[PDB]
Design a protein around this ligand. Structure first.
Ligand code: Z80
Ligand code: Z80
Ligand code: Z80
Ligand code: CL
Ligand code: CL
Ligand code: CL
Ligand code: NA
Ligand code: NA
Ligand code: NA
Ligand code: NA
Ligand code: NA
Lengths: 373, 373, 373
């Protein structure tokens, strides 16, 4: 029977993973640093090193922003420094595409995976001076007229699903085939939004936005990988299922929302969706659930497995990340039982809006597994 | 002789639990919503759905409170919106009671099980606008004279011990049996305490309390259960030990405290106590340990397993929920090694007070397992 | 080869550990309490009880500090009340030394092991009055001229590695035992640093420091151990490897730093280093990474396994303890793969400074396993 072959192949994959993790040599190492002015260039193609099993990339981004307006200030948007990177794209040595998503979606996934705001500093009552000492992720709440602010942001670009689950990792042992990590950074057009404009992709918004400009952006890419891979009789001990599976983040935009009607976003088939993020960009307005009747995941036979009002939806998210996502951002965890259908559209994500402004749209971000072939 | 029969029956139960969790698909859906004026009615009986394996109920409570006093305001008590529900009682299909406890004890257990204040929003230094966006559990610190405040509270009523441990869950396949979830809500008599009165059960206290009233109370009950239970050769694959065990929360009151003398609350026998909460209601005064010499758990043979000063007792609790329970509330975790005696009164919970005001009492809250037969 | 014997002995050690943890009687009880004036005495030798397997000691320290200066105030140092204990040393019944380290290093390890500032109270949006109720660890941020402040501090002195890993525990059944816990407390010379002086070891610093004095210090030592050890056919069931292993905390000082040059602190051999703490005492100045180029761990010729700038180094720490350590404190976790070297100097901890003041030094704190023989 073929079901036993599967059982055997998965047991062997798990065994190989455990052997690799036990015997391999975990390394994190810089591969590239660069400082630039986004007025000159904002898209960069980073070439990682071809060594061992690649697990992911830590992208450090710093920036200096000057407000040269005469009188008016500017204030952080909801996403703030998470919009320093507009887009990230990874291609493996076979030129197979993995993650392609926005900076803010990648950041929200980093938060979901950590269980708390990514790389944040928790506030406590400790008299010992713990706290925001090193400003790992940091941005001034406002930039006054004539002032210059310093920003720092970190993104984890995952290939492997986690430090102990190598599903999605990349074997980069061929010298000639090239990894490609594409970073598209913010610039003076995307980062600053005037009053009344849509702040989705911007870092600061306010009456002084027209006279704000980047002084510089700097990035440093660190590559996390496993060296000194174990070797056995038949050859390198490798988890074949893990290394032949893609773990990808992607996002898309959907429109056509109308008040009091279910707006359904179908899940594709053959993808194992681990998480879903839905941002209700209600025509440049981001509200704390007040413009939604309910959200749900639905099988299409009218059976809702979790049809909830917005506050109760947020309650489940508070159990995942110990806080709320920013206004208009809704998270759905399916990690223990991924959405997996055999026929396209057998499951959908549902938002029933109560208020729909002009140009309202739903930005969907997905976390999923899929096989190469 | 029969130790293997036990071992076998336990191995079968565990395996069946894993199969049920693996093959069934979890569902959470609304079962009842109602708005009312506590001046007319404050006791309600919710009728859950009889489907699959029932794990628990999420009770969302919203309320509007108006301070009609001319000049004086009111402020939250230590328990605040946790007293929106005064009492909860659950009857399973076979008319067996599970949880029967107060709202504040249920909330403190929800917190203990989460490892942090239930459904709270942690504060961090993140510049990304995480935080208290959705006001999942919320209540104004004060309600000024003439003002109206909005409250939201959530309670999880557990049947199953947790999402992965179905001990205590309820099989709702029986045709002739109605579950009963009984909820007693706060009213205009319990929710508001005058200056100098006992705030234990109240939501607000202050000089304006006599003229405070509910505008309205609303509740929504969600039921969490497992559907599509797996079927095997003999029939449904079910963990018989899990479904024949009761996971209950209960509360009691004890009086007779006198300064500098050990006040002992005996644990009953046949119950496997998982946690203990002791509230020192010192005649309407709730103090931060300054009225207690020490607390302990003690066996009949005179041995103290943890006789500690109140600060050190609170230190262990800080390792459990990352903060302190409100003033006068003391928590004891026995989940790894439940208090389980064969003879009533073999083990007791000890409080040695140093100050005892008139009408002092110890409100006990218990979390325990027990068998149906 | 006979390496099978190891396999068997370790499987037997883990089996004996599991049996002891299941059958034994966990107890935490007070062994000594004393109030003293540090002007008279600040060094104490605590004699624990000789019962069962000893896992560790919880040291509660309270203090009253008066600022007698006429006009000036004092403010907490970065380490603050963690310097109430200057040094702690444990000797087992065989007079073998286990932990020998400073108070601040012990506290930082307690924090690393908890995953958050040790015994801290997290801040949340909860309206229920959770929070800093009991002041488990507490110290006023400043003490005004003429004012008296009250301090409370807790240290966990570990013998066993954790509550479930008895590696490092001590068997205390032999009479004529020399079990000794030595505590060297702060006094009126170490606790108070003048402006411009080195605040490393002090609790308060400021222009009023010269006139600050302890009114009193009090300590209470609790001993955590296992009673009622199980007895088998051959005799007492004991994990021989666990009880013959030392789990120690130690610290040392290192000097000879020069700008832009790698300063390497070699790891000794035969020690299994679990964690490393490095404090850059830059001549009494403690900076948030701005005086360091990068930190790293490095092999003889296998290069750097994690060569990172200070902010990225701090990012990894934020994933461990949900915040930053105080200024100048850098943490490195090696718990899953301890640094174990066949030959001395095979591995080293590296700091490359960019600014080195006079009398700069690197205070190293280590967590490690080692065998008795
Ligand atoms: C898929 N299902 C297992 C999830 C049910 C989790 N469910 C829960 C369970 C155990 C303890 C506390 C809670 S609170 C809660 C709050 C909001 C929501 Cl939406 C659900 C829950
Ligand atoms: C009763 N026993 C099983 C628990 C001992 C736990 N014990 C402990 C152990 C390992 C690391 C840190 C700590 S802190 C602590 C603080 C207060 C109290 Cl009361 C106990 C402890
Ligand atoms: C420990 N290293 C060897 C493994 C890479 C961990 N790596 C990581 C991995 C998975 C998810 C998020 C992160 S963030 C991060 C931040 C700073 C640093 Cl220094 C590393 C990481
Ligand atoms: Cl009504
Ligand atoms: Cl003295
Ligand atoms: Cl680390
Ligand atoms: Na250009
Ligand atoms: Na709130
Ligand atoms: Na009334
Ligand atoms: Na405090
Ligand atoms: Na002095």
């Amino acid at each position: 029977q073929a079901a036993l072959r599967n059982q055997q192949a998965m047991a062997a994959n798990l065994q190989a993973r455990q052997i690799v993790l036990q015997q391999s040599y975990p390394v994190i190492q810089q591969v590239e640093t660069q400082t630039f002015d986004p007025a000159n260039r904002s898209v960069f193609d980073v070439t990682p090193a071809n060594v061992g099993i690649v697990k992911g990339f830590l992208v450090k981004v710093t920036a200096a922003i000057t407000n040269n307006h005469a009188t008016e200030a500017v204030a952080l948007t909801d996403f703030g420094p998470a919009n320093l990177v507009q887009r990230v794209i990874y291609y493996d040595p076979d030129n197979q595409r993995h993650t392609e998503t926005s900076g803010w979606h990648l950041h929200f996934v980093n938060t979901a995976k950590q269980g708390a705001p990514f790389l944040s500093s928790m506030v406590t009552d400790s008299p010992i001076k713990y706290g925001d000492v090193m400003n790992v992720i940091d941005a001034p709440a406002t930039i006054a007229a004539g002032a210059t602010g310093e920003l720092t942001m970190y993104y984890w670009v995952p290939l492997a699903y986690s430090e102990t689950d190598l599903t999605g990792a990349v074997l980069a042992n061929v010298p000639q085939s090239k990894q490609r990590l594409k970073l598209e950074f913010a610039n003076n057009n995307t980062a600053f939004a005037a009053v009344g404009a849509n702040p989705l992709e911007a870092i600061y918004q306010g009456a002084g936005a027209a006279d704000c400009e980047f002084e510089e952006i700097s990035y440093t890419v660190y590559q996390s990988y496993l060296d000194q891979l174990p070797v056995g009789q038949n050859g390198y001990i490798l988890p074949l299922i893990d290394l032949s599976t893609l773990y990808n983040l992607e996002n898309s935009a959907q429109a056509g929302l109308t008040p009091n009607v279910d707006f359904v976003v179908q899940y594709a088939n053959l993808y194992r969706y681990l998480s879903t993020i839905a941002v209700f960009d209600n025509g440049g307005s981001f509200n704390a659930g007040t413009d939604i009747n309910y959200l749900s995941q639905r099988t299409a036979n009218f059976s809702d497995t979790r049809k909830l009002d917005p506050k109760t939806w947020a309650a489940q998210t508070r159990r995942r990340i110990a806080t709320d996502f920013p206004k208009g951002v809704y998270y759905c965890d399916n990690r223990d039982k991924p959405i997996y259908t055999l026929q396209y559209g057998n499951v959908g994500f549902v938002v029933n809006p109560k208020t729909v402004n002009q140009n309202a749209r739903l930005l969907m971000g997905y976390e999923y597994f899929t096989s190469r072939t």
